[PDB]
């Protein structure tokens, strides 16, 4: 493969520095998929990573959940400016009478935290948590990246379509996107393809409330590259195509990053500095005020215990990259490697 040396040059240093057991990389250019596989999915079996290996992609799941939400909008089941309690009777009489579905989707409802409190570990406790939650910021004014926020968005989008979230994803949305090996619940027949994650102590590990919606997808580099293709070349189904397009619209910005539904976007060519800043600890962990929204690059990071994922693509240039690893290695390393490889592809 004439792209192998370029991809290897940016990826092999990551593997060495962070002792990454395995990584599946996929690149799109000129309508063609290219797969570059490294190391092992499972240190016990020694099974090689391939483009069919399943990795936990963590928050990259949010792009898929966002697409389901957009699909519900396209189907007329909900609108982004609906109050959240329209789709959850159990939220009636709370502050979620005054917070919109779009605000949940874009982490801007007013300071919902990164994670549920550890104690919130059941349906009953989760409903209680939202009903007692006290806003920190006015709706729309601040971005605080949040699993409870987008998790609730996805959960309520599923409810608006009158089906369970996992079923909608596995039976309708994901196969509609050409993603037939993408799961919230990995079935028996797919378990042999499922990597283990590796913690910092090299312990094998795999993945709470709204996990499915917020961070629970297992998928392959082949399936995720198919999703990238869907986000560039499109899909056959008109409703899904319109849904995908809704996920590209900018809602607001934080520095040089523009927040949409799931995807976070940048003007392209993008400097490494701009891409690092929008993916920085400050943006991920702290509340930041929302500013007016901005060729475009779209991306999403995701991590779980033992896993580290990144996807970035540029529709105007027909290029994209997926990097799925079974080590949670630092986001800036992901960004720098992707930026370098994409720049080589862009020419």
Residues that bind Zn ion (CB under 5 A): 1, 8, 34, 102, 175, 180-181, 212, 222-223, 248, 251, 269
Q: Between 8 and 237, whose beta carbon lies closer to Zn ion?
A: 8
Which residue's structure tokens are 């949010």? 62
Q: Between 143 and 181, whose beta carbon lies closer to Zn ion?
A: 181
Return binding residues for Zn(2+).
Answer: 1, 8, 18, 34, 44, 124, 142, 155, 180-181, 185, 201, 223, 248, 251, 270, 339, 347
**Residues 322, 324, 330, 333: is their CA dihedral positive or negative?**
negative
Catalytic residue, chosen from 59, 61, 146, 303, is 59
Alpha-carbon distances, residue 48 vs 36, 186, 223, 287, 306 (angstroms): 12, 19, 18, 41, 17
Nearest approach, Cβ of residue 252 and Zn ion (Å): 7
Instruction: State the Cα–Cα distance between residues 194 and 163, nearest whole angstrom.
Output: 27
**Contact by Cβ (8 Å): 307, 57:** yes
DSSP SS3 for 7: helix
Nearest approach, Cβ of residue 257 and Zn ion (Å): 15
Instruction: State the Cα–Cα distance between residues 171 and 45, nearest whole angstrom.
Output: 31
Cα angle vertex 320, ends 319, 321, to 5°? 145
Q: Give the count of beta carbons closer than 10 Å to the beta carbon of residue 293.
A: 13
What tokens were used for 295? 């060729």
* DSSP assigned state of 209: T
Return binding residues.
Answer: 1, 8, 18, 34, 44, 124, 142, 155, 180-181, 185, 201, 223, 248, 251, 270, 339, 347
Alpha-carbon distances, residue 273 vs 100, 278, 332 (angstroms): 33, 9, 10
Helices (H), 75-184: 101-105, 123-132, 147-160, 165-167, 174-176
Nearest approach, Cβ of residue 141 and Zn ion (Å): 12
Query: Active-site residue 61, yes or no?
Result: no
Q: Between 223 and 264, whose beta carbon lies closer to Zn ion?
A: 223
Q: Between 218 and 251, whose beta carbon lies closer to Zn ion?
A: 251
**Contact by Cβ (8 Å): 102, 81:** yes
Nearest approach, Cβ of residue 294 and Zn ion (Å): 13
Instruction: State the Cα–Cα distance between residues 69 and 13, nearest whole angstrom.
Output: 38
Nearest approach, Cβ of residue 285 and Zn ion (Å): 22
Q: Between 52 and 114, whose beta carbon lies closer to Zn ion?
A: 52
Instruction: State the Cα–Cα distance between residues 151 and 134, nearest whole angstrom.
Output: 18
DSSP secondary structure string for all residues of 318-344: TEEEEEEESB---HHHHHHHHHHHHHH
Nearest approach, Cβ of residue 334 and Zn ion (Å): 15
State the DSSP H helix or E strand holding residue 36, giving kind and residue range, or none if neither.
strand 32-42
**Contact by Cβ (8 Å): 335, 304:** no
Catalytic residues: 59
């Amino acid at each position: 493969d004439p792209l192998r040396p370029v991809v290897d040059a940016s990826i092999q240093p990551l593997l060495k520095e962070h002792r990454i057991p395995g990584m599946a990389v996929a690149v799109l250019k000129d309508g063609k998929a290219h797969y570059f596989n490294y190391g092992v999915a499972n240190r016990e079996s020694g099974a090689s990573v391939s483009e069919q290996t399943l990795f936990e992609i963590g928050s990259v799941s949010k792009t898929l959940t966002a697409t389901l939400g957009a699909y519900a909008v396209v189907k007329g089941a909900m609108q982004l400016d609906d109050k959240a309690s329209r789709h959850a009777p159990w939220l009636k009489g709370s502050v979620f009478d005054s917070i919109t579905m779009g605000e949940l989707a874009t982490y801007s409802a007013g300071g919902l935290p990164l994670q549920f409190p550890e104690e919130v570990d059941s349906s009953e406790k989760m409903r209680a948590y939202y009903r007692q939650w006290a806003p920190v910021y006015s709706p729309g004014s601040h971005r605080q990246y949040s699993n409870p926020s987008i998790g609730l968005f996805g959960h309520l989008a599923a409810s608006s379509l009158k089906q369970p979230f996992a079923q909608l994803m596995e039976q309708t949305l994901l196969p509609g996107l050409g993603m037939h090996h993408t799961y919230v619940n990995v079935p028996k027949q797919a378990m042999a393809s499922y990597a283990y994650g590796y913690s910092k102590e090299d312990k094998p590990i795999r993945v709470g409330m709204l996990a499915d919606e917020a961070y629970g997808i297992k998928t392959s580099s082949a399936d995720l590259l198919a999703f990238v293709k869907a986000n560039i070349g499109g899909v056959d189904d008109k409703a899904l195509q319109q849904a995908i397009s809704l996920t590209h619209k900018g809602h607001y910005s934080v520095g040089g990053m523009t927040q949409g539904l799931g995807w976070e976007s940048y003007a392209y060519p993008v400097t490494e500095q701009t891409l690092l800043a929008g993916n920085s600890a400050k943006v991920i962990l702290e509340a930041n005020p929302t500013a007016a929204p901005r060729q475009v690059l779209f991306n999403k990071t995701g991590s779980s215990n033992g896993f580290g994922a990144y996807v970035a693509f540029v529709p105007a240039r027909g290029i994209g990259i997926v990097m799925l690893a079974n080590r949670n290695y630092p986001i800036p390393a992901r960004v720098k490697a992707a930026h370098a490889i994409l720049a080589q592809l862009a020419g």
